[PDB]
Amino acid sequence: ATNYIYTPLNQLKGGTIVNVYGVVKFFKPPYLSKGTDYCSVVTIVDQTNVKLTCLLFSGNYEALPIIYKNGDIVRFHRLKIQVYKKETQGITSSGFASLTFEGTLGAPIIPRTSSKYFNFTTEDHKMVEALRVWASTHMSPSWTLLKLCDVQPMQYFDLTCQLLGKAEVDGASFLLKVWDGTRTPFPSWRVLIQDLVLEGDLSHIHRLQNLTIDILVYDNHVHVARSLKVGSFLRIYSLHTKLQSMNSENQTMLSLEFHLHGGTSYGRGIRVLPESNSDVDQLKKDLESANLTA
DNA sequence: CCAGCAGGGGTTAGGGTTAG
Numbered sequence: 106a107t108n109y110i111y112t113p114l115n116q117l118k119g120g121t122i123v124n125v126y127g128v129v130k131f132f133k134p135p136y137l138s139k140g141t142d143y144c145s146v147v148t149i150v151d152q153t154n155v156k157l158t159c160l161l162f163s164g165n166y167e168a169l170p171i172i173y174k175n176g177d178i179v180r181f182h183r184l185k186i187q188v189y190k191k192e193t194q195g196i197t198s199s200g201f202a203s204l205t206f207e208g209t210l211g212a213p214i215i216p217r218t219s220s221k222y223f224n225f226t227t228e229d230h231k232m233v234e235a236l237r238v239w240a241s242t243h244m245s246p247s248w249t250l251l252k253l254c255d256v257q258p259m260q261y262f263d264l265t266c267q268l269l270g271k272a273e274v275d276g277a278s279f280l281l282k283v284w285d286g287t288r289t290p291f292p293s294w295r296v297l298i299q300d301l302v303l304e305g306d307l308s309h310i311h312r313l314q315n316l317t318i319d320i321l322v323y324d325n326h327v328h329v330a331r332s333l334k335v336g337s338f339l340r341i342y343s344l345h346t347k348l349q350s351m352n353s354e355n356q357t358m359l360s361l362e363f364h365l366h367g368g369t370s371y372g373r374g375i376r377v378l379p380e381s382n383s384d385v386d387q388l389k390k391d392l393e394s395a396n397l398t399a
Numbered sequence: 400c401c402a403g404c405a406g407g408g409g410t411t412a413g414g415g416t417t418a419g
Contacts (some may be wrong), residue, residue, distance in 0.1 A: 131414060140411025148414065160413055182400070189413055199407040202400045220400055261416065278419070323419065343416065364419080371416050 107224055109182065111232070115153035119188040122198050126232055127151050128208065128240045129177045134342065134374040135169045136325060138162070145169040146369075149179055152239050159184065159195035161203075167219040169203065173340060173376060173384075174263070175247050176208035178236050180229070206233050207383070210241055249343075252391075253318065254287035258348030258361065261371065264341045265384050267392060268333055269317060270305035272298045279327040281320045283339065284313060286391030293318040294349060294360040305335045313399055320344065322375075324367025329375050338385045341365060342372040 112123040127149025135143040142162040147170055150156045159181070163169050170179055185198035204216040204223060214233050216225060249263045256262060270282030280296050282305070296319045303310070310317065320341065322330045333339065347362040365373060378385050 133414065138411040141409095142411055144412060146412080146414055158414070160411090162411060192413090194413065196413085200400050200403095218400095222400070224400090275419090321419080345416070345418095366416065366418065368416075370414060372414080373416070 109224060111180075113153055114149070114151045114157050115155040117157065117186045117193060117195075119186055119193065122183055122185050124180070124182045125149070125151075125157070125184060125195070126236060127157065127179050127181075128236055128244065129172055129175050129179060130156060130244070131175065131372065132170070132172045133369050133372055134172070134376045135163075135166050136369050136374060137328070143169060145172075147172065147179065150244075151236065154243075157193060157195050160197070161201065162197045163201075165219065171203070171205045171217040171219070173378060173382065174250065176240055176244065178206040178208050178233050178240075180204040180206075180233075182224075208237055208240055209383075210237050212383070252287045253285050253289045253316075256289060256346050256361070258291070258346055261343045261345055263372075264344050265338070265378070265388055266341065267338050267388065268335055269313065270303055270310050271330065271333065271335060272302040272304065274298055274321070277327070278321050278323045279330040281322060281330055281333070281341075282310060282317050283320060283341070284316045284318065284392070284395075285388060286316065286395035288316055289318060289361050291348060291359050291361045294362040295319055296321055313396070316395055316399060318361070318363050320363040320365060322365035325369070326365050326367065326373070326375065333375070333377070338378045338380070338382075338388065340376050340378055340384075342374050342376075343370075 131148040133146040135145045138144040145161045148158045182202040266283040266285045272280040345364045
């Protein structure tokens with residue numbers, strides 16, 4: 106019946122509505138725009154090495170591409186191609202639809218989408234496989250996905266973790282206590298907050314003290330941090346580590362601060378990962394052994 | 400893909416890390 110045609114990224118013409126396959130080179134997770142919708146920015150690339158930036162809007166958070174990390178594969182239906190400021194740009198069109206897939210070779214091809222129904226053929230399976238192999242041989246794996254024991258000061262990195270605690274601070278910032286089972290090279294900083302505010306299991310937080318980091322998120326992230334459920338699994342993008350040296354009269358002290366600064370550049374943001382995600386499976390293994398020996 | 404299917408309101412943001 107229906108046979109969708111997929112346009113290679115080097116054949117895209119302005120003024121058309123197309124369907125595309127791609128590998129994610131960069132993305133902003135959905136954030137509240139200044140308009141009525143969530144917005145997600147996604148730059149994709151295919152075998153032609155030509156890239157395409159896509160500006161996607163929706164009132165439904167999950168209707169935007171379900172992207173968890175660079176190297177994810179995406180398939181877009183009914184994406185409008187236009188020219189903005191003399192550059193090619195993909196934008197939401199009526200009925201826009203997204204499928205996304207893990208990029209790791211050999212993994213099952215399981216579409217991630219909010220669509221109730223979607224078209225998917227054997228050819229689609231093959232194209233996803235081909236993009237996986239091409240990405241394995243043409244894109245460097247991200248050096249930003251680091252466990253807490255591998256972080257260095259004065260760097261940006263993406264953190265897969267579990268949320269243990271939440272707390273208000275000063276309205277412009279918000280505290281998240283998270284862990285991943287590994288211990289930072291330097292002890293985490295402890296943000297100043299009121300003890301009654303700390304939302305979460307207090308004794309569990311206490312016995313995991315040596316493994317937990319404090320993250321201070323700011324500005325647009327606050328709302329998001331406020332909605333998170335304690336115990337859920339998160340990926341926090343472009344978290345910033347800073348080695349503070351607090352020295353009093355006859356004492357020095359080195360701590361690691363973790364800031365999620367305001368704005369959306371470099372993908373700064375938070376996404377909840379489902380338990381069906383494989384990185385969550387590995388994280389769970391680490392969490393179980395660490396909670397055993399803590 | 401779907402609210403719609405003899406076709407679909409409007410704006411939003413349009414990657415690129417000040418810091419607190």
